[PDB]
């Protein structure tokens, strides 16, 4: 479990991937031309996790950027950071999917498929020991949802024992930009629950709320939100590329966070967050970071965490942190707020520590919670879906590509089953 393969899908997935790779290069001290700037033993040894060393010391990331719209990939190739990527890992077709999950899943998605699988096989052969796959896409698109789910199915078919960790961008309950997004999202979750090992749910509205509320922003941009997501991604894999006291792994995340195969969905949170210029008025303390992480405003999913109940929690600290401090504050949160923690599982939360600090701060922490509150989101979309499917509106766009109403009914039934199971364990 050394080498990780990154796969970005769609407009959103590709943009997030760009931000993520920028962050990783900044952490490891890599120039955007592929030649490393700094190499320190903590940075230099574990370069093999995300990067292959090409001849003449130029480092290239193991990454696959896929979409059906050439313009996004053109813009990526003409950006600074366009050099880092080996040109063979960009794969795109001419005709997009609009926003239709059916086109990207079989009809117009089959235009690529095999090429992506071939480059995946080449990357797999080039790695000593595969660890898992990171798949960045947007639920509720045409390309990111359909082609993404199809690709996940193929990858798990060929590599069944490798970890599939998907970062999904969900619909927002307040004013989404796409009309038929519910159809796509439901269709996508149908496959996602059968293939993905762990899926981190994020929605843009919660990110915007963080931007304006805690950070007092004037007009945020997508790249700003993508930076938050990239920071969370970095935080997850920190223990793989760096030493520490309590190290963690993707399989370990799954074991600690997954009581039942049907609960792999997670909320994420990040600390600290302080608006510009008030940085001087802050103290970085493990208690303060814990307070930030359990604050409902710092959830990146639009569910109310106080409404549900926490099954399993995994916290990850970076920088100057005592294990004893983390144990103390964690147990204080467990005892004080014990109404939010399920009594069926005595150990509600587990901790990990990494000595390396994120750039710009002496201390920071990422928060992964498996809570029943996530059901709320599943309900909302579900309602919307059912409503539109009652009138069979927009259905002709889907059924013209070979879809059947039976598939939609099956997907809604699966969603209802998920919500029912989360209710069962909420108890």
């Amino acid at each position: 479990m050394r080498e990780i393969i990154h796969i970005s899908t769609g407009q959103c997935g590709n943009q997030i991937g760009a931000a993520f790779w920028e962050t990783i290069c900044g952490e490891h001290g890599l120039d955007f031309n592929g030649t490393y700037h700094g190499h320190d033993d903590i940075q230099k040894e574990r370069l093999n996790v995300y990067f292959n060393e090409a001849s003449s010391g130029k480092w290239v990331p193991r990454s696959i950027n896929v979409d059906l719209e050439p313009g996004t990939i053109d813009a990526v190739r003409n950006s600074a950071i366009g050099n880092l990527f080996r040109p063979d890992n960009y794969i795109f077709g001419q005709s997009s999917a609009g926003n239709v999950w059916a086109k990207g899943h079989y009809t117009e998605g089959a235009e690529l498929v095999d090429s992506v699988m071939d480059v995946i096989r080449r990357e797999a052969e080039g790695c000593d020991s595969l660890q898992g796959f990171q798949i960045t896409h947007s639920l509720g698109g045409g390309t990111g949802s359909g082609m993404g789910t199809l690709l996940i199915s193929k990858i798990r078919e060929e590599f069944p024992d490798r970890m599939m960790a998907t970062f999904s961008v969900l619909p927002s309950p307040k004013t989404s930009d796409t009309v038929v997004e519910p159809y796509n999202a439901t269709l996508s979750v149908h496959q996602l629950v059968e293939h993905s090992d762990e899926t981190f749910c994020i929605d843009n509205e919660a990110l915007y709320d963080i931007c304006q509320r805690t950070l007092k922003l004037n007009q945020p941009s997508y790249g700003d939100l993508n930076n938050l997501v990239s920071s969370v991604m970095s935080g997850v894999t920190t223990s793989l590329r760096y030493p520490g006291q309590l190290n963690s792994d993707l399989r370990k995340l799954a074991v600690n966070l997954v009581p039942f195969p049907r609960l792999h969905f997670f909320m994420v949170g990040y600390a600290p967050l302080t608006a510009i210029g008030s940085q001087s008025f802050r103290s970085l303390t493990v208690p303060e970071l814990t307070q930030q992480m359990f604050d409902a405003k710092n959830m990146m999913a639009a569910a109310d965490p106080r409404n549900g109940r926490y099954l399993t929690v995994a916290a990850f600290f970076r920088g100057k942190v005592s294990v004893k401090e983390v144990e103390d504050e964690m147990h204080k949160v467990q005892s004080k707020n014990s109404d939010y923690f399920v009594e069926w599982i005595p150990n509600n939360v587990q901790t990990a520590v990494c000595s390396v600090a994120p750039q710009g701060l002496d201390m920071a922490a990422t928060f992964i919670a498996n809570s029943t509150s996530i059901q709320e989101l599943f309900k909302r979309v579900g309602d919307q879906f059912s409503a539109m499917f009652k009138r069979k509106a927009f259905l002709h766009w889907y059924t013209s590509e070979g879809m059947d109403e039976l598939e939609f009914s099956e997907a809604e039934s699966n969603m209802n089953d998920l919500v029912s199971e989360y209710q069962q364990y909420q108890e």
């Binding site: 074991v255 004893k324 103390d328 150990n347």
Partner: protein
């Protein structure tokens, strides 16, 4: 006896082993390059201390008898780049390319068995070199993936191969209150099933209690895993001190087993280290034998979260180091017996075995433990230990009722009846412990 081999499994076990070997090198005066400089001869840096662990190779360089096993390569890489990378043979460090998560099933039944043959061969070669092997010394994390699974598997295989060698196990137990692993009780129960049938003597340390000692006795504001490991290492060193140096009453490991183990089971003593004195308070202390003995039985100086006053003491062994009079020690033990809180069981007329070693204790620079002219280690069998097991069992039951994380273990080649069997065996062990310890 002559030689003892140390075996470290998992992140925690390997870190503890690092601290222990650092401490041994300090006591014997061995350079981080593996050199007898720092004093070259006599029991500190001499054949007395060199036998038992360190093995003299060509050019007078000393390589410890130590075996590091981790399924996670990062820990052993970190050791390979540290200052003590020089001390040991590079082939004694064995690194796997996949973790066990915290899953006892992968370390025992799948990923751990891939390394098992290699580490067994290494143990066999080292054992061949050993002239007069006494036994083995195990460093575990009970409740982890590698320590639990690989530790139990390796221990069983080693017992099958040798079988008349003394097998010591120093295990780091789950915490009654604040723990870092969601499935830890599953692993712990599963491992105890094997540990009860293989390990000859098991020492248990709860990290919560050591943290309490660091914050209260040593008044350490921000303790680290390293300081905890230093304390534990001092305990182990004092266990082997009677083997490495001359004294009045020289205790062996077989003597420990004899006096502390009345029946085949009930091999799980608690450990305590009395002179834990802050360097700030170093000049306000007497260091009297009676005072140190009183500190031993103080719960604040115990290394497990268990109340020894709640139970009955079956048998204990004190181990004194430094300048100590035998008569003074005897008088202190008699006073402790007269306290009546010991609650000595009826079978034991004394139940207090005293070792005395004429070498003074030393401490690593990173700790607030000041140098003292005498020290004590306390190994006690008490009924109160059952409490810990009960705690673990309860945490097991609540999960196992819903089969909480079972699928992670079952997918790796485990059976549900195995869980039922291990839990049943633990319950039987607790029941017999209470049964004998009450009416002994």
């Amino acid at each position: 006896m002559r030689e003892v081999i140390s075996i470290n499994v998992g992140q925690a076990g390997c870190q503890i082993g690092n601290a222990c070997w650092e401490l041994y090198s300090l006591e014997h005066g061995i350079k981080p390059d593996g050199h007898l400089e720092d004093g070259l001869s006599k029991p500190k840096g001499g054949e007395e201390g060199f036998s038992t662990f360190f093995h003299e190779t060509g050019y007078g360089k000393f390589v410890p008898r130590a075996i590091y096993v981790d399924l996670e390569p990062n820990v052993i890489d970190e050791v390979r780049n540290g200052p003590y990378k020089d001390l040991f043979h590079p082939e004694q460090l064995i690194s796997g390319k996949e973790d066990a998560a915290n899953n006892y099933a992968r370390g025992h039944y799948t990923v751990g068995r891939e390394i098992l043959g290699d580490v067994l061969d290494r143990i066999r070669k080292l054992a061949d070199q050993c002239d007069g092997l006494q036994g083995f010394l195990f460093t575990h994390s009970l409740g982890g993936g590698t320590g639990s699974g690989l530790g139990s598997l390796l221990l069983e295989e080693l017992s099958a191969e040798y079988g008349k060698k003394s097998k010591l196990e120093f295990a780091v137990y789950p915490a009654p209150q604040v723990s870092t692993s969601v499935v830890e009780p599953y692993n712990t129960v599963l491992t105890t099933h094997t540990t009860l049938e293989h390990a000859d003597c098991t020492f248990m340390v709860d990290n919560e209690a050591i943290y309490d000692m660091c914050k209260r006795n040593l008044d350490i504001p921000r303790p680290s895993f390293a300081n905890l490991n230093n304390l534990i290492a001092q305990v182990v060193s004092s266990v082997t001190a009677s083997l490495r140096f001359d004294g009045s009453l020289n205790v062996d490991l077989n003597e420990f087993q004899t006096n502390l183990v009345p029946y085949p089971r009930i091999h799980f003593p608690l450990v305590s280290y009395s002179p834990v004195l802050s360097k700030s308070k170093a000049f306000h202390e007497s260091n009297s034998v009676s005072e140190i003995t009183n500190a031993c039985f103080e719960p604040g100086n115990q290394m497990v979260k268990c109340d020894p006053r709640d139970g009955k003491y079956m048998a204990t062994c004190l181990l004194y180091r430094g300048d100590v009079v035998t008569r003074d020690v005897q008088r202190a033990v008699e006073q402790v017996k007269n306290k009546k809180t010991v609650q000595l069981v009826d079978w034991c007329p004394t139940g207090f075995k005293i070792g005395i070693c004429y070498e003074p204790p030393t401490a690593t620079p990173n700790s607030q433990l000041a140098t003292v002219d005498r020290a004590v280690c306390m190994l006690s069998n008490t009924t109160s230990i059952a409490e810990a097991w009960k705690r673990i069992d309860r945490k097991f039951d609540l999960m196992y009722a819903k089969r909480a994380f079972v699928h992670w273990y079952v997918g790796e080649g485990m059976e549900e009846g195995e869980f039922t069997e291990a839990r049943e065996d633990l319950a039987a062990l607790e029941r017999d412990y209470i049964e004998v310890g009450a009416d002994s």
